[PDB]
Amino acid sequence: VHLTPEEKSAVTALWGKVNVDEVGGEALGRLLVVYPWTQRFFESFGDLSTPDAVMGNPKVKAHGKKVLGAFSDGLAHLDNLKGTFATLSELHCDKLHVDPENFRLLGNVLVCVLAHHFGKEFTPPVQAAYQKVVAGVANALAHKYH
Amino acid sequence: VHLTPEEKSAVTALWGKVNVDEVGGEALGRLLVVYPWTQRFFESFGDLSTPDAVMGNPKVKAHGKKVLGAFSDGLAHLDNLKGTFATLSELHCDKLHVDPENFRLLGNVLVCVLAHHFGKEFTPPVQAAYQKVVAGVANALAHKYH
Amino acid sequence: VLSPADKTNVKAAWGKVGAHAGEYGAEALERMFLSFPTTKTYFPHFDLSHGSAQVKGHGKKVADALTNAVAHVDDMPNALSALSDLHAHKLRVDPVNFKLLSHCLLVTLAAHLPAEFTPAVHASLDKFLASVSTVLTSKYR
Amino acid sequence: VLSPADKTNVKAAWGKVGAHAGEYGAEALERMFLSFPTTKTYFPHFDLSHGSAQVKGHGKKVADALTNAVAHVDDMPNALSALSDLHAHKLRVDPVNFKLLSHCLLVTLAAHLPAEFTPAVHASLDKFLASVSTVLTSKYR
Ligand code: HEM
Ligand code: HEM
Ligand code: HNI
Ligand code: HNI
C-alpha cells in the first residue's frame, strides 16, 4: 500500500487544491452514471434516470460531500488506514450492506475526476501515488467485512 | 488474512492427510489446462499440447511438487505469510517476471483439487479456511512486487 | 466461445448431476457465503442460518436456471434473457460476484464428481459458468 | 453492447483526440507501468523508464489499434481478429490486465479533454474500452 515521502508530499500538495465538497459530488455522481448498478443503494435519492438527473441530484451531491469528507479526513492517517476506517467498514457491512467492490469503483472514478480537474498537473507519478491511496482506502473499508 | 484458532486447526488437520506430490502435480497441471495462457512460463517443460500431455509431464509434476512444498512450509507461518514469502516474492517479480494474478489462479485450482480428492470431507467451513490461506499466500507472494 | 467439445463435456457432467442439481446449488451458495462473506451483502433479507430453507429454495432456482442453460447451450443469450434483465435492472449484483459463485459451483461439482471431474471437464465447466455469467451481466449498462 | 449514443460519444471523443492519439497511447502506458507495477512483468525486454523510445513506439501501435476499432465499432471482433490471436496465443497476457490499461487510457483522456470528458462520455468510453478488452481476450481458451 504505502507511499514514499515524495509521494506523500505529492498527495498532500494536490489535495490542498481540492474542493472536497465539489469533487465529492462529482465523484459519486459519475459512479452512478458510469456504473449504474451502483444506484441500487440510493432508491430514496429520487430521480437518477439520466446523467444530468444524477449529477445534479441534490441528495447525490450531499452524500458525495459526506463520503469525500470522510475520505479527506483519512488522508491524515496514511500509516493506519485500516484503523481509521474500521467503524465505517463495520457500518457499511452490517447496516448498509454495501459490496466492497463499490469502494474500488469509486476510487477509480475519483482518480478520473482528479485527472479531469487538474489536467497536466495530474502527472503519471501523482496518479501512481493516488492509486496507492484509493486502493488503501478501499482495502481499509473492506477489512472488517464478515 | 487472519485465521482464528479454529480455522488454523482445521487447515493443519486436513493438510496432514495431503499427498503433496500428487496434489502439487495435479494443481499445476490443471492450472495449465484450465487457464492455458499460464503455459507461457513453461516453454522449457516440453510437451504441453494436450491435457494428457500436461498432466503426465515429468517437469510439470516436479515443478508442482516443488511449488506446493514451499506452500506447505508457509503453513508454519500463518501469522506472518508476508515475511516468510518475501524472498520468493522478489524472485517471482524480478527474476521470473510472473504476473501475481497467476498466484490467485493457482489458489483457486488448488481448492478444486482438494475438493476433488477429499470429497465430502472438504466441507464448506474447511473450504472457507483454505480460501483464506490461498488468498493470504497469493497476497504475500505479490507483496514485494515493484 | 464454447467449443463443440465443451458442450459435450458440460451436458455429460450435468447429466450425471441429474436430480442432485438443486442440492448442489444450495451447497454452492453456502460455500460462497462462507468463503466469500462479501456476497452476503446481497442477501440481508435472507435467513442465512444453517440449513436455511430460504437458501435451499434459492439454490433450487439457481440450479434450475443452469439446467435450462445446459439444455439450451447453443442459444444461451435467449434462454437466459429474462434472468439477465432481472440481474441488470433489479438485483444489480456487481459483476465481480459471478466469478465467486462460479468458483463455488465448480468446487461443489468437484466434491461430488470424483470420476467425472477430469482436467478437460474442469476446463469446460469453468468456460460454461463464465459464459453464463457473461450473459447474466450483458445488460448491466 | 454499445448504444447509438455510446458510439456517437466515442467517435466524437476520439475525433477530438485526433493527431494526439499516439502521444496519449504512450502516456497511458507510462501511467499503467507506474500505477500498476505488475503489468511490467509483460515487458521485461522493454525500457520502461520515463522518455522510453520503446514505450513511445508501442503507444502508437496501441493507439492505431484503437482508432481502427472506432472505425469498425460495429464489427470489432473481426476488425481486431489478428490482435486477439496475438494476445491469446503468443503474448498470453492475463485478462485481468486489460482493465488496468483501460483505466489508464480513461485517465489520460480525462487529463486532456476537459470539455469533452462529460459523465456521459466517460461512461461510453469505459464501455468501449471494456468491449475492446473483451474482444482481445475472446480467444484465450
Ligand atoms: C450463474 C450465476 C447465477 C445464476 C444462474 C442465478 C440465478 C438466479 C435465479 C434463477 C434467481 C431467481 C429469479 C426469480 O425468482 O425470478 C436469482 C435471484 C437472485 N440472485 Fe442470481 N444467479 C446467479 C448469480 C448471482 C450472484 C453471483 C448473486 C450475488 C452474489 C446473485 C444474487 C441474487 C439475488 C439477491 C437474487 C434475489 C433472491 C431473492 O430475493 O429471492 N445471483 N438468481
Ligand atoms: C485496449 C487494450 C490493448 C490494445 C489495443 C493492445 C494493442 C496491441 C498492439 C497493436 C500490439 C502490437 C501488435 C504487433 O506488433 O503486431 C500489442 C503488443 C503487445 N501488447 Fe497489447 N494491447 C492492449 C492491451 C495489452 C495489455 C493490458 C498488455 C499487458 C499488460 C499488453 C501487452 C502487450 C505486449 C507485451 C505486446 C508485445 C510488445 C512488444 O514486444 O513490442 N497489451 N498490443
Ligand atoms: C455505492 C455505494 C457506496 C460507496 C462506494 C461508499 C463509499 C464510501 C467511502 C469511500 C471512500 C466513504 C469514506 C464513505 C463514507 C460514508 N458513507 Ni458510504 N458508500 C456507499 C454507500 C453508502 C450508503 C448507502 C450510505 C447511507 C446513505 C443514507 O441513505 O443515509 C453511506 C453512508 C456513509 C457515511 C455516513 C455514515 C452514517 O450514516 O452513519 C459515511 C461517512 N454510504 N462511503
Ligand atoms: C506462473 C506460474 C507460477 C505460479 C502460479 C507460481 C506459484 C508459486 C507458489 C504459489 C504457491 C509458490 C509457493 C512458488 C514457489 C516457487 N516457485 Ni513459482 N510460480 C510460478 C512460476 C515459477 C517459475 C517459472 C519458476 C521457475 C522454474 C524454473 O524452471 O526455474 C518458479 C520457481 C519457484 C520456486 C523455486 C525457486 C528457486 O529456484 O529457488 C519456488 C520455491 N515459479 N511458486
Tab-separated table of N, CA, C and O in Angstrom, chain A residues 28-29 31-32 35-48 54 57 59-60 63-64 67 92 96 98 102 106, chain C residues 92:
chain	number	residue	atom	x	y	z
A	28	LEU	N	-19.211	10.831	-6.759
A	28	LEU	CA	-20.361	9.966	-6.516
A	28	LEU	C	-21.319	9.970	-7.706
A	28	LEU	O	-21.824	8.927	-8.103
A	29	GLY	N	-21.567	11.142	-8.280
A	29	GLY	CA	-22.414	11.224	-9.453
A	29	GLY	C	-21.877	10.397	-10.607
A	29	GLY	O	-22.620	9.621	-11.214
A	31	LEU	N	-19.890	7.890	-10.471
A	31	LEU	CA	-20.004	6.473	-10.121
A	31	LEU	C	-21.356	5.920	-10.553
A	31	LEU	O	-21.444	4.863	-11.184
A	32	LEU	N	-22.410	6.656	-10.221
A	32	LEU	CA	-23.769	6.227	-10.517
A	32	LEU	C	-24.104	6.280	-12.010
A	32	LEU	O	-24.989	5.560	-12.471
A	35	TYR	N	-21.274	3.365	-13.691
A	35	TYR	CA	-21.606	2.017	-13.233
A	35	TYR	C	-23.002	2.021	-12.634
A	35	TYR	O	-23.153	2.034	-11.416
A	36	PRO	N	-24.038	2.028	-13.489
A	36	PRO	CA	-25.378	2.366	-12.993
A	36	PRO	C	-25.969	1.368	-12.010
A	36	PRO	O	-26.911	1.731	-11.310
A	37	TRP	N	-25.422	0.156	-11.920
A	37	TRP	CA	-25.923	-0.772	-10.907
A	37	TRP	C	-25.661	-0.266	-9.484
A	37	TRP	O	-26.340	-0.682	-8.542
A	38	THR	N	-24.715	0.660	-9.329
A	38	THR	CA	-24.427	1.225	-8.016
A	38	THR	C	-25.571	2.107	-7.514
A	38	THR	O	-25.610	2.463	-6.340
A	39	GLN	N	-26.515	2.430	-8.393
A	39	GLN	CA	-27.700	3.179	-7.985
A	39	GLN	C	-28.589	2.391	-7.022
A	39	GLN	O	-29.481	2.965	-6.394
A	40	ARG	N	-28.341	1.088	-6.897
A	40	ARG	CA	-29.195	0.210	-6.092
A	40	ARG	C	-29.283	0.633	-4.625
A	40	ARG	O	-30.256	0.299	-3.940
A	41	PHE	N	-28.272	1.356	-4.146
A	41	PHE	CA	-28.223	1.778	-2.745
A	41	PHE	C	-28.932	3.099	-2.498
A	41	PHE	O	-29.022	3.556	-1.358
A	42	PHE	N	-29.424	3.721	-3.562
A	42	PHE	CA	-29.873	5.103	-3.453
A	42	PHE	C	-31.274	5.335	-4.009
A	42	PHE	O	-31.546	6.387	-4.585
A	43	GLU	N	-32.165	4.366	-3.820
A	43	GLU	CA	-33.534	4.493	-4.316
A	43	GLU	C	-34.259	5.679	-3.679
A	43	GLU	O	-35.136	6.282	-4.295
A	44	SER	N	-33.873	6.024	-2.453
A	44	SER	CA	-34.520	7.114	-1.729
A	44	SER	C	-34.024	8.492	-2.169
A	44	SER	O	-34.497	9.515	-1.670
A	45	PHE	N	-33.077	8.524	-3.100
A	45	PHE	CA	-32.497	9.793	-3.530
A	45	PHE	C	-33.303	10.437	-4.658
A	45	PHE	O	-33.003	11.552	-5.082
A	46	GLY	N	-34.315	9.736	-5.150
A	46	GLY	CA	-35.180	10.295	-6.173
A	46	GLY	C	-34.707	10.032	-7.590
A	46	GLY	O	-34.256	8.932	-7.910
A	47	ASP	N	-34.804	11.051	-8.440
A	47	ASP	CA	-34.544	10.902	-9.872
A	47	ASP	C	-33.075	10.627	-10.203
A	47	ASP	O	-32.200	11.459	-9.960
A	48	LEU	N	-32.826	9.446	-10.763
A	48	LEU	CA	-31.497	9.033	-11.200
A	48	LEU	C	-31.541	8.514	-12.634
A	48	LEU	O	-30.707	7.701	-13.029
A	54	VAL	N	-28.750	12.549	-12.393
A	54	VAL	CA	-27.849	12.020	-11.376
A	54	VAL	C	-26.879	13.091	-10.889
A	54	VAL	O	-26.766	13.340	-9.687
A	57	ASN	N	-28.560	15.844	-8.929
A	57	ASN	CA	-29.397	15.406	-7.821
A	57	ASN	C	-28.863	15.936	-6.491
A	57	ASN	O	-27.732	15.638	-6.112
A	59	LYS	N	-29.462	15.212	-3.404
A	59	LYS	CA	-29.117	14.180	-2.430
A	59	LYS	C	-27.832	13.447	-2.818
A	59	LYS	O	-27.036	13.083	-1.950
A	60	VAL	N	-27.631	13.235	-4.113
A	60	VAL	CA	-26.373	12.681	-4.596
A	60	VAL	C	-25.222	13.613	-4.238
A	60	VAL	O	-24.182	13.181	-3.734
A	63	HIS	N	-24.563	13.579	-0.441
A	63	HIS	CA	-23.909	12.360	0.014
A	63	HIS	C	-22.462	12.300	-0.453
A	63	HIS	O	-21.589	11.821	0.273
A	64	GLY	N	-22.210	12.790	-1.662
A	64	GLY	CA	-20.851	12.882	-2.170
A	64	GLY	C	-19.949	13.716	-1.273
A	64	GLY	O	-18.786	13.371	-1.057
A	67	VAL	N	-19.204	11.560	1.873
A	67	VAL	CA	-18.274	10.481	1.583
A	67	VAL	C	-16.849	10.986	1.388
A	67	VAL	O	-15.908	10.454	1.980
A	92	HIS	N	-20.749	-0.121	6.885
A	92	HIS	CA	-21.097	-0.452	5.507
A	92	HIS	C	-21.395	-1.935	5.322
A	92	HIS	O	-22.183	-2.315	4.451
A	96	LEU	N	-25.458	-1.148	6.173
A	96	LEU	CA	-25.733	-0.642	4.835
A	96	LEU	C	-25.681	-1.736	3.766
A	96	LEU	O	-26.236	-1.563	2.677
A	98	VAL	N	-23.243	-2.900	1.808
A	98	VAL	CA	-22.605	-2.416	0.594
A	98	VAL	C	-21.438	-3.323	0.200
A	98	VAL	O	-20.440	-3.422	0.910
A	102	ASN	N	-17.728	-1.761	-4.546
A	102	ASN	CA	-18.139	-0.381	-4.784
A	102	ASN	C	-17.068	0.629	-4.377
A	102	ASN	O	-16.931	1.680	-5.010
A	106	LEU	N	-15.426	3.414	-6.853
A	106	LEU	CA	-15.408	4.833	-6.508
A	106	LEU	C	-13.987	5.381	-6.587
A	106	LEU	O	-13.774	6.491	-7.075
C	92	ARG	N	-29.046	-6.037	-9.576
C	92	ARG	CA	-27.882	-5.172	-9.756
C	92	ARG	C	-26.685	-5.624	-8.920
C	92	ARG	O	-25.981	-4.818	-8.309
